[model samples]
Each structure stands twice: as structure tokens, then as C-alpha cells.
Target: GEYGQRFMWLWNKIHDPANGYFNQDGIPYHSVETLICEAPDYGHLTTSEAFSYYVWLEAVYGKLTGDWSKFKTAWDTLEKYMIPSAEDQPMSYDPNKPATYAGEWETPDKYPSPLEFNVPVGKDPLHNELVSTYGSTLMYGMHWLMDVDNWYGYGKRGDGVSRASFINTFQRGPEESVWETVPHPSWEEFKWGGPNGFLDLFIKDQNYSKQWRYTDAPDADARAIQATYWAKVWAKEQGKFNEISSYVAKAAKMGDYLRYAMFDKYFKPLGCQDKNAAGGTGYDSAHYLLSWYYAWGGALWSWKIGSSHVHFGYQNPMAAWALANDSDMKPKSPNGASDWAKSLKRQIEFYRWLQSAEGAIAGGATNSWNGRYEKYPAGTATFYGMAYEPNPVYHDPGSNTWFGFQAWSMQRVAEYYYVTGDKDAGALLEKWVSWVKSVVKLNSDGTFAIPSTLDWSGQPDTWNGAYTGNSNLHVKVVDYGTDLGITASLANALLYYSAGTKKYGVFDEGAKNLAKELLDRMWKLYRDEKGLSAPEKRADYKRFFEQEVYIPAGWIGKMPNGDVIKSGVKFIDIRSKYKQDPDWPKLEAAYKSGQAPEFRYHRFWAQCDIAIANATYEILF
Candidate 1:
């Protein structure tokens, strides 16, 4: 009943005949001039959740009510964008070889092409493996959801692509396989492994080279799942017992590798880290997103916080799901090995350990990695070289960098609860709601501002900036805007939180309050134009808020003590106690020029992302 009208509103709102590209280009990217690009390659850039959003929409609508026309429109939008066109083939594609799928390039340009002339990106050669695998995984998941066939590109997109053909191109040598039977590394995977690191991108291959080795782990697991699905289908319809057996064996091998390499090795935790400015000392919390992974490749230590990304959280959504579904898979964590019955607890505990008293969980950044390196100065210098690249800017101690979405960005809320729920998690959700009510609400100017950072810890209570420990050092957004993408996600969580509270009986009141707060407002924000429009610029943040002065349009906070106070500069209390650094200008420039997380600037893009996350409401029913 709840899913009915909500589903109808979702369908009619975006499914209008000819609104724009990707059918309902909710909040498409609007590229800026050399500073940032509005849109980049991701699952839901064009449309929220890409193809699956509407497929699930259709499934929800059709099953709930008697209408599913919105599904057709959702499918049609993707039909043109994702479906292989005459332009569908890659730049380096070879029809004769399955390994060539690894070589498939999106644009005609070769590797070494810069993403925007600054950062050297090897997108050309490697995209095929990552994209095809992820896209295929989503398609297979869709088939499982509705009656769609196990078609990645063929029936899903009607592109005539087959599983055999796809595996042929992407799969590498059997010896290199995760399972060792179909041992494979999409061609791009292997190249980035060896040569790509040797010459181009400048970073040595050892780190960047094997980076995607984990990437292939999930892809292999995905393929195995599809293989398993197909095996069942083939056995049921075509009586292909031998084919089914082969598929099962393939799934077995692949799943085994996923279990060992990804979960066992990659997700394994270190003892702990030194005290962080934000989380405090000796916080034994969630493990890294695999900080080791970010250390590799062009990223180096520049933007990477730590390990868990490497281990899979937000980086790979389905990794846990795949492992969780397998009864035979013995997935372990610091908490305990979570089987399906306990998988939900394990997942919630992962967040609970790292949950701030304020209730925000910075996603997979269980490891406040900078603190680890900060303890070791030499390591910080090396990280400085790796991150700055050509520039000589280094990190300083007390630099409080934030990891936004890791905490509150809920891309899939209902999806998370469908599988699991915990009493502690129920409380954790309330704390999250409290964080919004406390921190974000405190910061909002009577506006329903939904924008957030993975982490924004320079000073207390600021929404969209990070406090780098430097003289007048701050990393704030150029154009601060609400992230509507997670707005809907927030609503979804609250929706279920409301239900869980209602079911659990105690939390019903707070859960319902948060649900109303998030859903009713669409988690939208109202903010002062001048304040929200503040450009990303340097600001001097001195401790204890000695004085607040309006120095520049973008600047906000205390200036360093005895610093020259220009009339038009943003006011900050200049504490002489916090002496200015000797190499001030150069270091300050590096911090100022440094980028925020990708495409975080655009207004509509983020708002749309928030709105899309709301689509999760369909599942709540």
C-alpha cells in the first residue's frame, strides 16, 4: 500500500516522454571550467542507480499496483545510453579475442590522456573490465529481482552480447584466476598490473599494478553468481546437467577466491591506530577500506584515508551481499564470522564500532589513516611526495581531514535493512537522526540543507569543509550545496527506522519524527545564497575561535596570530600561540588548489543524487 502511490509518483515524475538524456536525468552533472566536471563515469550518473533503479521501480509498481508503465520508460532511457550502440564497442576492442574485452576503451583516445589535463588518467585501457563487470553484475541482480533473463547486455540491453563472449574477452589466464580454474584478469587488469605502471602514470606498477587485483576479485564473484544463476536456469529448461555442473564448479572456484582473498586477506583488521583528532586515541573500530589499495596507482596517499575501501564497503556494494548469500561461505570479521542469520548484525556492528557519539559513521574509513602516518613523520613525507605529485606540498600533524559519505551517505537504505536488522543498529539509526538534528540542523540557516561531506572535521559544526592543520588552513567547498542523493537515502533509512522503531515499539516516536523530517522535506536545504555560494578558498582556522571576522567572500574563521589582516579577508582569530609555518605560502597554495571529492560542487547533480537515493523507498513497502 505504501509502495503504491510512492511508486506511482516516482514513475510519473521521471518517466515523462522526452525530458532529457537517460530519460530522467534527475540531477545530471554540469561540468565546470577546468576546476571540476559535473558528471563522471559511475553507475548512476545519467540516471539514479542506472538501469536497476527503474527495473526495481517496475517490479515494485507492478507487484504492488496493476501498473508498471514506468518500467518501460526507465528501460528505454537506458536502452540508448548503456545498450551497446554502433558506438558501443571500445577503442581497443578486438572481436576475435575474449581478452580484448579487457582492452575495450570507452573513448577513442588511448591511455595517458588526462581526465581534465591535470590528473593523468589511464581510463582508456582499464574501463572495460571494471565497467562491463559491474554493469553485468547489476543486470544479473536485476534478473534475480524481476523476470528478466540472466542477460548482461543481450536481453538486458538487446546488444547480442553473450556470457561466453563476455567471459572470453575479459577472462585472463586460468593460472591467474581467483579460483585458479577460470583464472582470469580482464586484459586491462593484466596491463595495469604490469606495463601500465612501468611507464605511463609515473607511479610504479607494484602498487598501482596489483590495485585492480582486488577489483577482479569481485568481478569474478559476480560472474560466478551469474554462472550459478544460469546453471539453474539451464538445468530447469534445457536439461543441461553437464553445463549446470560446469557452472556450479566455476561458481565454487570463484566464490572460494572471493572468500579468501577479499574477505580473509583484504578485509582482515590491524590491531588499531594512534589517537586521531576526531575519533580520539586507540579507537578499535571498523577496518580500513584497505588503505593499501589507495596507496597504489595515481591516487597515491593524496586522497586516500585508509584500508576498508580496499576491503570493500562503499567501494563494492555487492561484495558483502554475494558473500552473505552463500551458505557455504564462512565470512569473518573482527566482530565474528557473520553467516546469513548473523550477517545483518555483523554489518551493523561494523558501523556501530566507528559510530561517532554524534552518531555519524564515515562509511568505510574505519582507519583514520592520516593519524597512522602522522605518528610516523617519515611516512608522512613519503605520502606527501606520493600525494602532491611533482609539487612539494607535504602533510602536517594535526591536519584534520574529513571523510564525508563514509558516515551518513546512504546510497542503499531499504536494501540494507531487507537483509538484516539489529537492536543496536536501530539505536545507531536514531543517533544518525540525532546527528542531523544536532550538527546539520544547527549549521543549517533555517533551510533543509541536505548536503554533507564524507567527513568535514576542521572545526566544530561546519557542514562542507575539512580543517587541514595549517596556518589559516581550511579545505572548504567552492560552491556548497545540498546532496539530495543522500537526502532520499536518509529518508529511506528513516522510513525503515520508523518501521523498525514501530516494530521494536520503543523507538517508534523518534523514528517517525526523523522519517517525517527527512521525507517531508525531501531532505532539501534552504541556505543563504552568499553563504552557500562561498567559493572553495583558503581560510585561516585558529583554535578556540578567538575572533570571527569577515575577511573574504569565501573565508570564515580565526586568522593566525600576527598575520597581516587585509581589509577584505575572511576574519579569523590570529593566535600568536599557533605560529605560522615557515614555508607558509607554498604549503597554503597546495592546500587551496587541492580538489575536494569528485563532482561535489554541482547543485542539481547532488540534489538529484539525493532524490535518487529516495527511490529506495519503493523497497520499504
Candidate 2:
């Protein structure tokens, strides 16, 4: 239990109020500092992804100490702030006519996309079932982003004083990076974002209505359920199932709503090339794999959208297995468990179909080519009729370029194989772990090297419902460094595969030893006063100074903080607060020196992942 002690220590550090990770309202912030920027623009801004990690961390705590209070509290906090309340998303909806159609363009410049009523869209098969089962049109899932400190002054309910307000970015398209975003409040008040608010920045309509909308990151939601499954299992083992049974049920409900992520955006039939393709027919429109995001408009103008792109990194068979097989975690909705069962099988197959020739997984596939129903290039690869995209969703950084996705996704596969010993999953991990071993380097002096960035060259063969290896698809290691978060995730995957192989009497001593070494090195080398973290040379921060945030030539607006949003605005010009941040002067100095600013970020998700990885090692060993 030595590793368990380390987990407890990290847990205590995270919970300490002095650290400022937790707000006065008890919602977790994205990081310890306000100057840091990654996915969330401001460090004070939290995310549904972080809340999911908070729930997961507490679930692990409950498993180790038989104390479920924190688990319940964390989930309660998540429900209260992250998921929109009925009042927050007020309105009744029709399942047959779920959402209006809008084309997703290539970049922010191409946006303010016209909302097209002539296009066909499919019926939402699950909405009626979900309402009958839960008796509400309100979604039970989490919204992706929120302002924990109300940084831009779009405070709770637009009063501009309360903390923890709903906010959103990335409404433009694939090329619209976080640097190129205009963050706005979830509900339009017309206080800052031009005449029609941020709606005019993304959508072109006859008349825009002030509304609320949210996008859900399916991976994070699935992770929360996956963590819950472990808690349920461990609580039952301790004869304390009652302590967490209610929470388990809540997780099941979230899983049920998560099925919304499986359908196409406009509910058009899969592989439909034209805008007028026939609308969906119930379950036939479902891709059965977790996509990039599933979003919904608010009560004033009720609408919903499921993503057409399916990324391999977001698929979680473990969550699906639990939703289907675990009684307490199985959804009460009539077809929910069955849908997950189908998804579990389908996700594993999706992995097999996308595995590259060199044993790495490729990006993903999209039903809507270029997100506009446009034609794909000649002889483009297909996965179950969907076009293969090496970089599925965002193109700014090339989605699959980050090696963290490989580690994060493959870890789920390893965990699934550990529990079920499914031959297909085992086959995938067998090759995957081997590829990982080839790229990883462990040093005796408590330092290591692991693949940081990945590069893809070709596409996989079309899926014909079988597991034959792709000859043309390949991946290259473009860079290597010790990224603590990814290293921890990679170590966990190796540990799970090692443990699973041993359980089945096919133990691989090499994997177990490598995983152990990786963990030991990180724990020894990366420890700091804050937590475990490696210094990240943020070369991308240059975008803050150089990148032009595209705004329409004639359109004009202001941020709630009074920063003008005009055509020639730079990324940092609108975000004037960065200049006043305590960490800003140092970054600004480094930028002038032509050097990337270095930051040892204590991201909430990364820290929790490290703690959980240590505890997972103790459990598996």
C-alpha cells in the first residue's frame, strides 16, 4: 500500500484550500495559476473534463478508504454546476424534429454559417425514451467549459458578480483553434457580443434568438462512468455497496444520455454525401462510437446535435461494458443497455479497423466529409462507410499529433482486456504495448523519454467486418520528451496489460518491469512543491502574439470587459487580462527574447491522473 500512501498525499494536497484549486463554492478550477493557457483560455476557467476527473479521484479514494462521502459530494458538485439545470435549459422538445441543420465550415473566416432549413435531418430516437424514463427535456450530461472565477465578467446568470459561470468557445469550425476563439457566455444577454451576441459570430440566420447551448466531451463523461464502475466494484467487495449505490445509479443515467453522442449531427444516414440525403430512421443513424462532441441548444430555441466524427482516442469500451453488464450501473431506459452493448462491440471493432501498419492507432472517421457533406478525395479510406480522417476533428494542431491521445485511449483498451480477457482487445493491446516499448526509454537516474508527438502518413484499409492488418497505414515518432501526464497514462496501460496477461497465464515480465520503471522515474524526477509536473516549453504561445483572430469585416462587438472585437484583432488583443496576470510579464519577456515560455503546469487532470496511476499500480500488482 506504499503507492496508496502517495495517492492519499496527492489527494490531500489537491484538497487544501490554500492551493486555490477549489473555489469557495467547491467547484474545481482548471489549474493552480491563472496565466496558463491550453484548451481552456484562462487557468481559472474549469471544464467538465476536470469535474469528471474530480469525480474519478474521489471514486478511487472511496475504493481505497471505504469513504464514499467525498465521491458523492464531488458528483453532486458536478451535477450542480457542470450539468445545466432544468431552469438553465428550459423548454419542451420534439424527438421527430430534434435540430435544425447548419454546415460546419473549414475555418473561422468561413463561418457565420447559414442555418439551412432545406437540408434533411434525422429523428432523435432516444429523446422520447429518455424523457419517459427521466421525465425531463433537460439534458443530464455536462457542458464542456465554464468560467470558475468569471474572468470575463459574464458572471452567474449575467449578474457579473457570482463565480462559476457557463461559457463556450470553438463555435467556428475545425481550423478554429482556442487561440482564434471569441469566448462568450452560454446564455446570450446581448451585453457584449455585438447586436445578436456571439450567435452572429458562428451562425447566419434570418433572426437570431438569445439562447443557451452546451457541448459535451464524450470521453470525459465516459471516464466518469468508468471510474464509477470501479467504485461500485470495490464498494461491493468491502460490503459497503449501499454507501455509493445511489451515485452508481446517477452514473448510469449519465451514461444513458451519453448515447446522444452516437448519432450523426443532423441525423442524416451514415455515408450520405449530399445535403438532402434522407433523414435518419431511429437507431440506423447511430454510429455506436463516441464522437468528438454532442451539443444542444437551450429552452428558448430547442435544438440538439450529435457529432459525425468518431475519434479512436475518445472510445471507451470499459464504460460501455459497465453500462451494459453492471446492474446498478445499467440505465433504466429500455434500450440504453442494449445500445451500450452494441457500442462495446462496435468500439473494439473500430479500434481494429483503425490500427496502423506499425501498430499505432490512426485518427478516426467522419460521416460528414469536411463537415459539409462534400465529396472525399479519390480512393479515400472508409470505416464502416465513414471516411477516414487522419486528423478527425481539429486541424490547427492535427488532432492525432499529440501522443497523449494514444496513451489515453489505449489505457481504456488495456483495462477492458484486464476485466474481460476479450481476445480482440488483447490482440490490439499486444501490438500497441510493443510499439510503446519500442519508443519509450527509461533511465537509471530517475529520468525518462517517451513519445510526445506523433505523425501519420497514410490511411487504413476500408473495414469489411474483419481484423486484417493495414499495409499502407503508418505512424512516425515526430518527437519525444517526458510529458508527465502522458507518461503516467502510458505506464497505467502497460501495468494493466501486464496484470491481465498474468491473470490469463500469459504473463509478460518485460511490460510489467517497463511500466514499473516508468512510474518510479516519474515519481522520483518530477516531484515539486505543487505536485508532479514537467516543464512544458509552450512554443504555441507565440500564437497569442502573432495569430489574427478572424472577425467579419463589417461586424463589430465588445467583450464584457470592453475589449473591442474588430476585423484586425490579434488573439491577445481581445484577452487584455493576460497582460495583468502575475505570470504574464515573464511570458511576455520570453516572447520578446524569441523563446517559448516554459511552464510547469499543475493541471488538475494531469495531477489526478498521476495519483490514480500510482494507486492503480498498487491494486494491479
Candidate 3:
């Protein structure tokens, strides 16, 4: 009786086989079509980020209805395809010795950077505890990218026959956008690239060895755990907690491995300036904020590295709070809960430190400036010795340029505020909510606009635990659009903040009204046969024909499908598959007309977030 028909209508659009959202393995594709491009470089290829939304979508379904089976099935599918099998990662880790050092350069042309043996990488403090708890060295975390349809033809584990192959891109550096990347199989079987595989493109050593490697998007895993926390709570409310208890345990276990993302790359000290400096002592390497990723190499020489950059978009205080405080969801590893407890506090403080004068959050901080332990200007601000970077990780698009990061990150902060009524979180959400509410517009004709592109100015003051405001930090809303995914996330954040504050007799009806208006307007305007989606003008897709991907002067390689990857290769030249796609004519027309091609993309994550926004309004109101 409590079910929202709007959510089920959206759900069927995603699950229907004829819609082509799910592969044969029941895994959700990143989007319905194959010709599109974004972070994953292709639309049909799936990602752990999309799977996390899949789990959250099903978890929301369990809340609407009493059935928990779909939620369990979703997590099972994610574990099967996303997490690396023990066979895939057959090597154990050494706590005393973590990995050799590799310097990160600014541009793709500057690599392959030489691997330095003299740089002292510190001990991996989590490895022993993780193994002791899980009884295996295999990582339980999901690899970020995968080719779901085998469009590139590198099959499962590089066998060249199966679908859903683990693939990687974006290794070169901050400037290596998706258009500049060379997609390589994670198995590194040398089936698709130059003689030494894609490794030679990113790193240099005397000898090359075949290895399996993966990068984890911690925000995705944390989102899945956040979903599980809600699932258990709703199930217990429905007297059905036992039905999904096992899945909840698995979520806790996942949180245990997510600790790997909280440390500095190479285990170096937080503020160490020298490239050759000795490693940091116990816990000194841990930054306690979720960084961009945590990557590991397997088979050839097992090694792991955490991201030095901490982007505001990637931090998830809600997940950390659940892993630390929720009895059913607490990580079972010896230090897992305690580690998350520390991370929970640190993440909230990070938000406070980065919050702009306009109430919007700034980019983030980094332990390694320019990704190479390079010196910064003499008077730059710092957060716990880490320098403030306007764009923390990638510089091509400026990581914090999109307001979607603001919505996605602040939604978690809103949820944490809702759960804990923590005054610090409430304070951040108050200003953030006001800033978002001021900019968001719901037209009378059932169209809406929210912040899309953002421009930042000034730096946050160096933090020293005292609560002084960030006077100089500011953000200007450069542009606005009715981006449904972002609107949904922002609406949900508003809803949670409004509801949370109402509980403490601090009613913010304006925020509650704005969230409802945004969601209702989106539902009225954007609904189609598939789902709710606005037409996105692909101005960047023009780069498909113009962007020249840099390959080493003498080096040459081939994609698994025999597309040549060598010097002077255009983005379209190496990714020849785009020409065969059904959507190619659109791009052809765009090139001919000199106008950006517009596409109605039903991205899985967007649709799921939209459904949840609808569900959230129903549940909370």
C-alpha cells in the first residue's frame, strides 16, 4: 500500500530485457546505448559506480515492498562480476614492504615515468588485518571499469572469448582525459597492446612483466554500503531483517577493504616534500579522507598504491559513520571500525575546511602536489599538512567544475546529518542547502535549472582545529541546466536536510518545498518510454574527430579488434568501433553541420538516483 507507482514504472524500464540495460549476466550497463562517451569512454561498458546504483535501486525497492530478494540478488551480481576473484589476484601482501615508487607527471607525453627503487614506501598497515579477517589476500573491492558487451573483444580475464572483461584507462595523469587514454585489459595478457602491453605507456622499468591490476573508486563502494545500511534499517522496520542479513554482512566486509582508500600513495608521510624521503610511521600515512582511488597490481609483483589526492566529491562520511557506528554494519576486521570512526570525524572536518564563503564546497587537498611531491608556492594553505588544490586529481576538465560533485557528495553529508543530528554536519548542510536553494529554479512550464558548471576563486585557510570561517573561498555558478541526475541528487540532499532539521524543531520548509518542486517538475517534463532523461548536448564529443591521442614516437600497439594504436592516432582512429554503432549517423550529422550532437542518455545511475529521489520524498514526507 505504501509503494510508489512512479518508482516501479522507472524500475521496469531498467529491468526490461528489450531495453538492453542489463547484460546476459544480469549486470547493469552504464547506459543503454553503446556509442556515447564519458568517464568510461563508452556507453555499453559498465562500471562499479553503475553497479552501486543498481544495488541502491533494488534496496529502495525492498523498502517500498516487503520483498528483500531483489536487493540480495543485486549485491550477489555485483560480487560475482565486480570483485576480483582469488584466482585473478593470487598473491599475498607484505605489511613491512608495500611497493616501489612511481612518479606521476602532468601530461601523457611525459610518461612512462621511471619507477624509482630508492624512494622509501612505508608498510601497509591494513594488509595483515584484512587477511586475518577475510582469510584471503584477494581484494573484496570492485574494479572501477569493465567492458560489459566485449565491444573491444578482450574477453573475461583476457581469454578473448567471454563478455564483461575487466578493462582500465586514465592512467597517464591529470591531463589524460578519456579521449587521450588507451583502453587496456586489466589482465595485461599482452593480447591487445604493444609487446609489453599498456604498462610501457604509463611506467618505465628495465624489464616488463605481465600482470593483473585494478583501481577502486571508493565512492562507489561506499555508496553500496550506504545502500546496505538503509536496506537493513528498512528490513528491520518491516520485520524482515533476517532475509537480507547475509548481504548486510557482506557490506560490512566491503567496508573493511575500503580502508585501503584512506592512505597516501606509497605510504609516504602526509606532508613529506622530498621524493626520496623515508616512509611514514604507523598511521601517519593514513589521510582518513577517501581519495580518488586505491589501485593494486597482481601476479608479476603484487603491489598496491592509494591516491594522494582527496577530492571533495569522493568523500562519504555517511558510509564511514555506518561502518563505525551501526552494530549490524560495523566492519569485522580488527581495526576496521576504529579506522572508519576516525575517517568519519575527519571527513566532516574536511567539509568544514573546504566549504566556500558562498556555502558551496571547494575542490579538495592533496598530499602530493602535481602528483610528484613537487614544491608549491610559499604561502599556500594546508589541511593537516596536505596542500589545498583547486582541482585535486584531474586537470583536463577541472575535477570540481561540475556541480554534480557538489550534489553527489553533499547528499551523503545530508544523510549523515539526518542519521546523527551532528551539529557540524547540520551547519555545513544549512549553508549548502541555502546556496543550492538560491540557484535552483523550477519553471512554471514544468522545466527546471540547477547549477551545472561552477567556477572557484581563492583558497581555504590552513586548518588548525579552531572554527574560523573560510572568508576568501568562493564559488560562482557559471552555468545551469536541467540535468536530471544532478537535480535528483540535489533534491534528495535537500529532502534529507529538511527532514533531519525538522526533527530537531528547526523546520526548513523552504528546502523541503524546493526539493519536492524540483522532483515533480522533472517527473512531469522528462518522462519517456525508457525513463526520465533530458537531452544532453555533447560539445565535448567534437573531440572524437579532432583529439589526437599521444602514443610514444617509436611505440606501436593494436586493440584486440585490430584497431591500430600508434603515434598521431586520432581518438576515433584507434576506437574504430564507433563507426559501426547505430548512433554513428548522429555524429556524422554533427560533423557535417558543425553543431554539437544531442543525446538522450538513460544512464543507470541517473535513473536510479531519480527513482530514489521520488522514493525519498514519499518516505520522508
lDDT for each residue of candidate 3 in 460-542, tens digit (9 for 90 to 100): 89998654678899899999887898899998999999999998658999998998888888888899888878988888888
Q: Which stretches of candidate 2 lie over 4 Å from their true place?
A: none
What lDDT would candidate 3 get against the real structure? 0.89
Show the colliding residue pairs in model 3: none
TM-score of each: 0.43, 0.98, 0.98
Give me the displacement of residue 182 in model 3, in angstroms: 0.3
Residue-level lDDT for 449 in candidate 1: 51
Q: Count steric clashes of candidate 1.
A: 61
Residues 1-621, candidate 1: write the lDDT tens digits. Answer: 443444345444344444331212322212111122111111112212333333444434443443334434434433333223332222232211111001112221222222221211111111233334334311111111100111112111122322211111111111111111111121123321123321222111233422211122232233233224323333434444443343344333333323222221111123222321222111122231212121111110111111222211232222344444543332222211232223333444444433444455532322223312123323221111111111011112111122234323332322344334544555556666665544434234434554343332221121112221222112232133344444544555566666665565564565446545655454334222211122232232221122232222322222112233222422122223222433234433454665322222323333333333344454443
Which candidate order results from sorting by lDDT in descending order? 3, 2, 1
TM-score head-to-head 1 vs 2, winner: 2
Task: Please list the residue runs of candidate 1 whose C-alpha ends up more than 4 Å from where it truly belongs after superposition.
Answer: 1-7, 23-59, 66-199, 202-346, 363-420, 440-447, 454-481, 522-621
Question: Model 2 residue 179 lDDT?
Answer: 91
